[PDB]
């Protein structure tokens, strides 16, 4: 492997200060401009609106327009300008660094896989939550589709197994994956109706397409809120924080363009404008950056290091989501 | 949208000359006759007085007497005589033109919002500075009211993200908004005492009302001075300038009239006589008009175009603050 933060050190250890517990939700296909906090005309995040300590970031751009391109870049040391997708898996990434320094890494996936990010770490630290073998919440809908909230089940046991250590938990969402947006949420989030069903998105009435997309966002609002609520059950023993960033956006009929995956040189802005949220308990001493900070996926790696009191010279002066 | 400047062209581009960086402070409720430079009996602008290259304009008349009426007119192509507040939001305005031409437009707001001026542009180019979500300077007074100087924090982040482009930054002030003028300034500006603190201004003793109003001007003097000082930190790489114009004046008990918003047809002179200041660095080549030029809000649009070397037929003959 080729290293980029061999110099990295953790300034303080959980035996002298409170251990730190962080949930990083890797979102899927969510657009910044369909978030209520960013000006959208519908209340797509009603549950997050009721939680104090949530920062919504209004100017975040993804590294690319697809899961395969963006997810390795989100955890990279290279930054979007120097990032290479084909050789990313051979580079030391930020999870490699945190694991080397003693942070317990867990990756639960209801999307696909880590796109190479977890490859160097033991297989037991990656868990497939797309099937009923691990996910207890797949029988809540007629498609028998496993839900993101299922990734929260049993995390109390993971904390008990790593009692006293620093912990970083990645939850890779099914989220707003298309084209069958109507399958991405249970009946309790079917607020906006009617919805488009079927696959020929250009043939669907446009408003019904948007309705299905917005209902999926409601289910993600719920998932992030329940992630924070879980972390709050551990706030006494742990300094708890939550980071959410979507891997890319989505086209929804603009210029007749749908879905994502366009090359960056010709991708419409809708495919790279993503939401990001950060929450932390009042005890942690962590302070968010201003909500209007110009941010990209390049901010994720220095954010994760900073959350765990880690200094790496490569990202020393890189903009983060927190101060 | 109804267009007025589709012909606009930029004569020189920032890839072949110095990029230009301009702050336009959109003022609030300030009266021209309470400015020291216009003959007021008190030194209400002590810090601006120490800065070389500031022109004070002694004869400026606002488009109207309220924020909702004046602010869209300040950015309009139509001029006061043809301006229609009810359809202003659907007209192409000067920020639309400059954005189309590639100038990076930013609007930070510690007042209310842009009154429709920014509505056609991406929402990430507007930022609310009335709350600690963005404003780092709120805990400086017993009301926790966020301060205009907080709009200057993190502007280096913005400049770095637009490195080498032309930039126009609007800062919409809380300024001298009443009736609670006493809330508008921190203690270091409480120079004139005693101060009116009642909401029913006609019940306050007249001198205490004046004192609160003048103290708030001292805070605006400080804010404008700090805006120029920030620009000065970029003057080697950028051609820097600062424009200040208030949106309207204020009645302070004359003929029993308080606050503002009087219809133009019978508004008192003190509600439309506003200060204007222009500052520029020596290298920009920008030259101010004579300080006693008869000016109105109609001069703002041609001033902004000229600062970025843009010509548009609609305002070719129009008087500006600069040559
Ligand atoms: Ag490197
Ligand atoms: Ag110790
Ligand atoms: Ag993803
Ligand atoms: Ag994706
Ligand atoms: Ag995955
Ligand atoms: Ag999926
Ligand atoms: Ag539609
Ligand atoms: Ag616990
Ligand atoms: Ag949309
Ligand atoms: Ag920071
Ligand atoms: Ag016209
Ligand atoms: Ag105003
Ligand atoms: Ag007076
Ligand atoms: Ag006003
Ligand atoms: Ag405003
Ligand atoms: Ag105000
Ligand atoms: Ag008096
Ligand atoms: Ag600079
Ligand atoms: Ag002139």
From Swiss-Prot, chains A, B:
Changing residue 260 to A: Abolishes transfer of phosphoethanolamine (PEA) to a lipid A analog in vitro. Almost abolishes resistance of E.coli strains Rosetta or TOP10 to colistin and polymyxin B, by comparison with the same strain expressing wild-type mcr-1. Residues 1-323 are periplasmic. Changing residue 247 to A: Abolishes transfer of phosphoethanolamine (PEA) to a lipid A analog in vitro. Almost abolishes resistance of E.coli strain Rosetta to colistin and polymyxin B, by comparison with the same strain expressing wild-type mcr-1. It is a multi-pass membrane protein. Phosphorylated at Thr-67; may represent an intermediate in the catalytic mechanism. Its EC number is 2.7.8.43. It is found in: Cell inner membrane. GO terms for molecular function: phosphotransferase activity, phosphate group as acceptor. It comes from the Bacteria. The modification Phosphothreonine is found at residue 67. It catalyses: lipid A (E. coli) + a 1,2-diacyl-sn-glycero-3-phosphoethanolamine + H(+) = lipid A 4'-(2-aminoethyl diphosphate) (E. coli) + a 1,2-diacyl-sn-glycerol. Probably catalyzes the addition of a phosphoethanolamine moiety to lipid A. Phosphoethanolamine modification of lipid A confers polymyxin resistance. Confers resistance to polymyxin-type antibiotics such as colistin; in the E.coli strain W3110. Monomer. This is the first (November 2015) reported plasmid-mediated resistance to polymyxin antibiotics; although it does not confer a high MIC it protects against colistin treatment in a mouse infection model. Colistin is one of the last-resort antibiotics available for multidrug-resistant Gram-negative bacteria such as K.pneumoniae, P.aeruginosa and Acinetobacter. First identified from a pig farm in Shanghai, China in July 2013, retrospective screening detects the gene in (slowly) increasing proportions between 2011 and 2015 from pigs and chickens, and also in hospitalized patients in China. Belongs to the phosphoethanolamine transferase family. This is Phosphatidylethanolamine transferase Mcr-1. The gene is mcr1. The chain holds residues 219 to 541 of 541 of the full protein.
């Amino acid at each position: 492997t080729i290293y980029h933060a061999k110099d990295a050190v953790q300034a303080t250890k959980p035996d002298m200060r409170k251990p730190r517990l962080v949930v990083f939700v890797v979102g899927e296909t969510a657009r910044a401009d369909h978030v209520s906090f960013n000006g959208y005309e519908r209340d797509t995040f009603p549950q997050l609106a009721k939680i104090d300590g949530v920062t919504n970031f209004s100017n975040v751009t993804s590294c690319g327009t697809s899961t395969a391109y963006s997810v390795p870049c989100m955890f990279s040391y290279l930054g979007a300008d120097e990032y290479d997708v084909d050789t990313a898996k051979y580079q030391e990434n930020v999870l490699d660094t945190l694991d080397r320094l003693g942070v317990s890494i867990l990756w639960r996936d209801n999307n696909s896989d880590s796109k190479g990010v977890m490859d160097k770490l033991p297989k037991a630290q990656f868990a497939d939550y797309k099937s009923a073998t691990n996910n207890a919440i797949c029988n809540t809908n007629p498609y028998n589709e496993c839900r993101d909230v299922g990734m929260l089940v049993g995390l109390d046991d993971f904390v008990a197994a790593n009692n006293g250590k620093d912990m970083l938990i990645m939850l890779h969402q099914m989220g707003n994956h298309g084209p069958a947006y109507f399958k991405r949420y249970d009946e309790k989030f079917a607020k906006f109706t009617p919805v488009c069903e079927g696959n020929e998105l250009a043939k669907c009435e446009h408003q019904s397409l948007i309705n299905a997309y917005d209902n999926a966002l409601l289910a993600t609002d719920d998932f992030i809120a329940q992630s924070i609520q879980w972390l709050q059950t551990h706030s006494n023993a742990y300094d708890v924080s939550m980071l959410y960033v979507s891997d890319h956006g989505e086209s929804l009929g603009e210029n007749g363009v749908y879905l994502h995956g366009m090359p960056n040189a010709f991708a419409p802005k809708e495919q790279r404008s993503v939401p990001a949220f950060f929450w932390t308990d009042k005890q942690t001493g962590i302070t968010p950056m201003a909500t209007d900070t110009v941010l990209t996926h390049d901010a994720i790696t220095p954010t994760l290091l900073k959350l765990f009191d880690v200094t790496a010279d490569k990202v020393k002066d890189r903009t983060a989501f927190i101060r």
